[PDB]
Amino acid sequence: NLYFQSNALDKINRYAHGFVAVPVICACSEAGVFELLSQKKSLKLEEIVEHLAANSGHLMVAMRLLESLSFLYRSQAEEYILTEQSQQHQIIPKALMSLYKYPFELYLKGEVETGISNWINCSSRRWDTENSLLSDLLDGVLLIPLLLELKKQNLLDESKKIFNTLTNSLKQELSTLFINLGWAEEKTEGLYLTDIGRFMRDRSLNLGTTASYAPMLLQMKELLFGNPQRVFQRNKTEKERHVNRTLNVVASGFQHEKFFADTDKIIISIFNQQPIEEQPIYIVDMGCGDGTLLKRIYKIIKQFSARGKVLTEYPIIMVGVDYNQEALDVTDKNLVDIPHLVIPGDIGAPEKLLEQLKAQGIEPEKVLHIRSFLDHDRPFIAPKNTEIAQARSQLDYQVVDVDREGKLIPPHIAVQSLVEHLERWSSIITRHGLLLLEVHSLTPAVVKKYIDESESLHFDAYHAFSMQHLVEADVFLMAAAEVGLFSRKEAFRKYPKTLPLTRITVNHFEKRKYQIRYATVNDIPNLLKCATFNPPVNEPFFQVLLKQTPTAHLLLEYQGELVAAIFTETKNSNEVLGIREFLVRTSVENWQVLAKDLLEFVEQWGVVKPGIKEIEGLLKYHEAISNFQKSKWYQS
């Protein structure tokens, strides 16, 4: 493609970064967060929480955001320490927050008393700083609600003589703005908006998901330091005040549809699988929305699969499921001319779905279950298994989740919740499997490193602020593996494709008889007795490995019995993951297949592990398990 585009993609991502970060920085500044960390240099989160009477959950979201922007960092003892970048909070005009409430619709159409000349001028002086990232962060506060309103009124699609439907003053400001941004130019005759100008106009709708949370972000003060339920509580009408949902849904659909196409190869594979009669009959989408994905899947089957040639004899029935009756209605209308069924249901209640299906006469073992981008937005159910939750508490999970009081849900509680949620789904999944697309958060160390390349700084923040439940992509794959659900190699896709970070996974989960979980210190006695490719490992080395990476050694169990285990090392600025040990128990039926599945799972897990650029040892340890007797294992 073209050369200007690397710079242009950075700008538009930075704009969305600033749209969320500026409310956080401003609220933290006004409340004395940066001065508190000056008067005392090393404070833990709960000390900050106590002294500022803060909401620990939302405040954790802010601190993570500030750490990803390098305004602070955490010590070995998890204490927060300011950096030189933190002084940038003084450069930010705290009146910028007015723009989250400014009627840009009335400004265009000249029905407003006060314009935006000061901000346009601020933008032209690069916001009185030489930090290029900072200037773009502040621009995004202005440009995002402005660029969106310009397109909503078609003031940009006629790129010949832009702005002439506007009064002279309005025309002059906007012209000065775009010309200073390099978005427009005028050589002869009239004004013409350039490449970077068209780039921004074409991609505008992406910004609409971030922009739709402007009400929530305006009340950052209340989230961090007040009563957060005043931001979210819903009327008798039951309309959402924290987000403009209508713009959200539309902008979201336009993004999700990019990933719907990756289900095509899965669908085609499933419905080419011989024989026809053993294929699924029902395709059941939990959280169907407007039914876009169901419609696509049906057409792909009809046009591109063996199944599509014989629907007369072997019909397919599409089933949309949603907890919102309006969604069922739009879905029922979008699926015209497709054999379909719409029924109410909830992402947290697979048992009720199954009961509702049988009431319709649907044979449950003939269902392919699907969904996209819904598990992270489920109603949070607290863990019921307190023992396993307790065993989990010593793993170093970095999930940030906020409850209804704005209190921080401990990371191991959030993971245990996800595990128990997926277990409920696992108990109804059939031989046909579970097609599942999900979005995922990143760790701040990885976000820090890929600030220009990835959407995570703002996406993870507004997701956690709004009490949604993102996890890292490896945590999600582990939670599925703990309950027997494994993402099929041939179906899998992750995004971004070539950076060492995973924001989106496309999965075809299949239910298997075994589970995969993290090895812990409690497994060492059993581990010592396994057959082992390297000479028998002694307990201290297991302790060393378990201590430096508590969530990087995987073991496979079947009916409570250890079958196999793989330990790893993470090295080289945490960019390299390497296979370090391979253990099996050859007394377990089909152990060699299972050990091969575990090596396969470790590769997939390492592919989605935050920050991992390459995996070492796959060939060496594949050879060890593939030619087991010739490889001369110990203790076999």
Ligand X SMILES: CC(C)(C(=O)O)C(=O)O
Question: Does residue number 135 form part of the binding site for ligand SAH (CB under 6 A)?
Answer: no
Size of site (CB under 6 A) for ligand SAH: 19
Instruction: Single out the segment in contact with ligand SAH by CB under 6 A; choices: 319-327, 438-446, 504-512, 615-623.
Output: 319-327
Least separation in angstroms between CB 234 and ligand SAH: 14
For residue 341, the surrounding DSSP H or E stretch is: strand 340-344
Q: Which of 164, 161, 151 has its CA nearest to residue 193?
A: 161
Which strands form 79-82's sheet, in the order they lie side by side? 43-44, 79-82, 72-74
The binder of 231, among Mn ion, ligand X, ligand SAH, none, by C-beta within 5 to 8 A per type, is none
The dihedral region occupied by 410, where left means phi > 0, alpha psi between -120 and 50, and beta the remainder, is beta
The binder of 568, among ligand SAH, Mn ion, ligand X, none, by C-beta within 5 to 8 A per type, is none
| Binding mask of the shown chain, residues 327 to 356, with x at each position contacting ligand SAH by CB under 6 A | x-----------------xxxx--------
Task: Name 583's bridge partners.
Answer: 532, 565
Least separation in angstroms between CB 400 and ligand X: 15
Question: Does residue number 56 form part of the binding site for ligand X (CB under 6 A)?
Answer: no
Instruction: Single out the segment in contact with ligand SAH by CB under 6 A; choices: 121-129, 194-202, 316-324, 577-585.
Output: 316-324
Least separation in angstroms between CB 327 and ligand X: 13
CA gap 164, 171 in Å, rounded: 7
User: 58 with 228: CB under 8 angstroms?
Assistant: yes
CA gap 471, 454 in Å, rounded: 16
User: 467 with 404: CB under 8 angstroms?
Assistant: yes
Instruction: Single out the segment in contact with ligand SAH by CB under 6 A; choices: 13-21, 133-141, 198-206, 374-382.
Output: 374-382
Scan residues 280-309 and list those touching ligand SAH (CB under 6 A): 287, 289, 292
Least separation in angstroms between CB 444 and ligand X: 20
Residue 440, marked binder: no
For residue 200, the surrounding DSSP H or E stretch is: helix 195-202
Instruction: Single out the segment in contact with ligand SAH by CB under 6 A; choices: 371-379, 398-406, 446-454, 503-511.
Output: 371-379
CA gap 124, 80 in Å, rounded: 35
Residue at token pair 């593939």? 626
DSSP SS3 for 568: strand
State the DSSP code for 87. G
Residue 369, marked binder: no
Residue nearest to ligand SAH (CB): 289
Closer to ligand SAH by CB, 372 or 515: give it. 372
Residue 285, marked binder: no
Residue 452, marked binder: no
Scan residues 193-222 and list those touching ligand X (CB under 6 A): 209
Question: Does residue number 324 form part of the binding site for ligand SAH (CB under 6 A)?
Answer: yes
CA gap 273, 490 in Å, rounded: 14
Residue 298, marked binder: no
Closer to ligand SAH by CB, 139 or 322: give it. 322
Least separation in angstroms between CB 466 and Mn ion: 8
Instruction: Single out the segment in contact with ligand SAH by CB under 6 A; choices: 222-230, 320-328, 597-605, 607-615.
Output: 320-328
| Binding mask of the shown chain, residues 251 to 270, with x at each position contacting ligand X by CB under 6 A | -x------------------
Question: Does residue number 244 form part of the binding site for ligand X (CB under 6 A)?
Answer: no
Task: Name 191's bridge partners.
Answer: none
Residue 381, marked binder: no
Closer to ligand SAH by CB, 287 or 606: give it. 287
Q: Which of 178, 175, 169, 185 has its CA nearest to residue 201?
A: 178
CA gap 336, 87 in Å, rounded: 58
| CA distance to 53, 115, 122, 162, 186, per residue, from 189 (Å) | 60, 28, 29, 12, 7
Tell me the DSSP string of 470-511.
---HHHHHHHHHHTTEEE-TTT-EEESSSSS--SEEEEEEEE
The binder of 248, among ligand SAH, ligand X, Mn ion, none, by C-beta within 5 to 8 A per type, is ligand X
Torsion angles phi and psi, residue 495, rounded to 5 = -135, 145
Question: Does residue number 153 form part of the binding site for ligand X (CB under 6 A)?
Answer: no
Beta strands in 91-171 (DSSP E): none
CA gap 275, 260 in Å, rounded: 26
Residues that bind Mn ion (CB under 5 A): 377, 468
State the DSSP code for 376. G
Least separation in angstroms between CB 259 and ligand SAH: 8
Least separation in angstroms between CB 377 and Mn ion: 5
Question: Does residue number 248 form part of the binding site for ligand X (CB under 6 A)?
Answer: yes
Residue 270, marked binder: no
Residue 468, marked binder: yes
| Range 386-398 burial, b when 16+ CB lie within 10 A, else e | eeebebbeebebb
Residue 323, marked binder: yes
Annotated binding site: 256, 322-323, 346-347, 372, 376, 463, 468
Residues forming contacts to ligand X in the complex (CB under 6 A) are 209, 248, 252, 373, 439, 468
The residues of the shown chain that bind ligand SAH, judged by CB under 6 A, are 253, 256, 287, 289, 292, 322-324, 327, 345-348, 372-374, 377-379
Residue ranges for the known binding site for Mn(2+) are 376, 463, 468
